Design a protein around this nucleic acid. Sequence first.
DNA 1: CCCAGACG
DNA 2: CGTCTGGG
Length: 93
Amino acid sequence: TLGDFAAEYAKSNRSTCKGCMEKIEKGQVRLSKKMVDPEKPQLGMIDRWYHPGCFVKNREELGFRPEYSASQLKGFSLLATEDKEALKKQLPG
DNA sequence: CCCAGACG
DNA sequence: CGTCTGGG
Ligand SMILES: [Zn+2]
């Protein structure tokens, strides 16, 4: 049972990192685990976003397999090479 | 004022 | 789904 993760340039300035609970700026690289919001299970499965760094603090709780690296962050390939590199560094080996 | 579309 | 607001 793999977690389903995603990467992308934030679509707007109105989402909030789940790790630090700070607002993510439009345009910034952001990672998501799609899952159920505790306080809103009514919604069911939804995107929960993270600053890449904050995402990594919680790599384990989130269900990230360092064995598969970045391939499991659906949409990685769409990112600029610059960004694809920076990201790949932080991800645990 | 409006409302698509982002978010939770 | 209801809410909010960026960009008309
Ligand atoms: Zn954060």
